[PDB]
Write a protein that binds this DNA or RNA. Sequence first.
DNA 1: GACCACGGCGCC
DNA 2: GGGCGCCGTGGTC
Length: 542
Amino acid sequence: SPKALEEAPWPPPEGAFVGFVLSRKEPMWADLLALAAARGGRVHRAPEPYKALRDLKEARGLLAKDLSVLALREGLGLPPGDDPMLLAYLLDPSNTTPEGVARRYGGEWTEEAGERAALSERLFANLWGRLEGEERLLWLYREVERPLSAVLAHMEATGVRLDVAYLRALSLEVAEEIARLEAEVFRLAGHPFNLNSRDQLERVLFDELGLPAIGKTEKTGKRSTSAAVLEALREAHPIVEKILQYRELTKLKSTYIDPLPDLIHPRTGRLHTRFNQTATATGRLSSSDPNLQNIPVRTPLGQRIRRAFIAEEGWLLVALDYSQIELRVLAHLSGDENLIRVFQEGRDIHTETASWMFGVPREAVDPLMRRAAKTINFGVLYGMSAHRLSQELAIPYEEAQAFIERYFQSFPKVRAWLEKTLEEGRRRGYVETLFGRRRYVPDLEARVKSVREAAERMAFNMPVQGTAADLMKLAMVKLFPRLEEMGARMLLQVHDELVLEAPKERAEAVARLAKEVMEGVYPLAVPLEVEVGIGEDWLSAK
DNA sequence: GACCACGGCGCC
DNA sequence: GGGCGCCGTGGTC
Ligand SMILES: Nc1ccn([C@H]2CC[C@@H](COP(=O)(O)OP(=O)(O)OP(=O)(O)O)O2)c(=O)n1
Ligand SMILES: [Mg+2]
Ligand SMILES: [Mn+2]
Ligand SMILES: [Mn+2]
Ligand SMILES: [Mn+2]
Ligand SMILES: [Mn+2]
Ligand SMILES: [Mn+2]
Ligand SMILES: [Mn+2]
């Protein structure tokens, strides 16, 4: 039999599938080691990869977005196009890696660019075939995921400005506060130990100081030293508050204050995350290297850190955040008339819960009190126990149970939608979003109750979180070209929030426009309301 | 140096 | 409660 794949000289014809090898996975930081392309039955290998990038009109193939990011870094406008990872991810969002997708759908992810190109081509063919007749998944691919990949490449290449000297100064200040706390912890324990070691702390708290253990850890069943356990022990011994404070500051310093300034890119002078498009079971994006979707916001030090994310000189940040997003989406999905009415009347369920929680009038609820109510409202919605709710609010168990009962009694059709969702997931093997994005949940049939019930909580959540994800993605695709036209920049997505950068002279017009695009994206049974703020830094913009 | 699993915890 | 990614530790190679 004749050979299946022939080598031919660079450059490839238009429409070819690319393969490429990076020195490291992060495209803003990677050296392009090899580039190749495949089409029909030929493979073309680039003599010198960087120069050869200039020969391509489009990056089509596995991880197309990442090659596009690298090209943009080098000042080339090479947009991403088809990518089999996106097809695979829509078929089953457990398809998250090229290694796994290759094995499942047609071969092997190797370390050679030509092989990667040929792999890209055959995977695309095979996965296109698998989507035959999947009209809703195809619509998601063509209208959302494929165009979104080009938006994400542009965002990644743009980056965000960081106040490096501010964070360097903050490190020195927090180091002194950490030393005070750790020293006090050791004074109170009677000796030093590694306070970063939860194993060493466990022995200190429960074996040496004789404090009561409250909870156990999941995989190894050690006595937990989690914040929930420490909070329960706060009045038992003065060491506990000191450990909580030490943990707060060390978490911020080790995760954000110290690492972020070291990640400023030498070419751009900015901070560049990865927006991972095939990483979550629900259709959300993720952000990594560094994660810019978990920048602190709740504590005073945390807020200091958020102040380091700044606009370029002469620009402003614009932050837009969907109000009460998953409660609105749930209203639509469930058709609950009471929940629909809440939003028709302009009510805020987080503010109402905060009022009850803190025992103050709604007018007296401040933003951090309202924020605290989110874990309560979403926790309860998605199945939090009365035991946990009682601990979290320091109320009697019976009062926590009453809250839970009243919450679902208020929105009677939510329970009906839960049962419909679970039956469908049992029968089909998967649950789905409004747009038809699917998540397979085989443990809905598990015979171990704890395993099955966990699966049920995963399954009930997915259509709500995932529909919210679908809406935000669609909004990004519609908004991006509007911003390009106005000389504004899309910088960050944070699940139901976008952070943009706009010249000062155009910032108010950009904010107004972006708000309207987001609110009007895909109308539901309730209004989608967007909160918008403008500022020189991310804290000020919210 | 690197890997991972884990506990833990930051955000949505 | 659900969804993530990164930290340091500990064990390991
Ligand atoms: N503890 C949380 C916080 C958030 N989310 C999910 C549901 C809401 C969504 C977006 O987060 P927020 O913007 O913080 O929530 P919101 O209800 O949209 O609040 P806001 O009106 O302040 O934007 O992420 C969740 O499941 N659990
Ligand atoms: Mg938000
Ligand atoms: Mn590799
Ligand atoms: Mn400024
Ligand atoms: Mn929101
Ligand atoms: Mn459906
Ligand atoms: Mn741009
Ligand atoms: Mn984990």
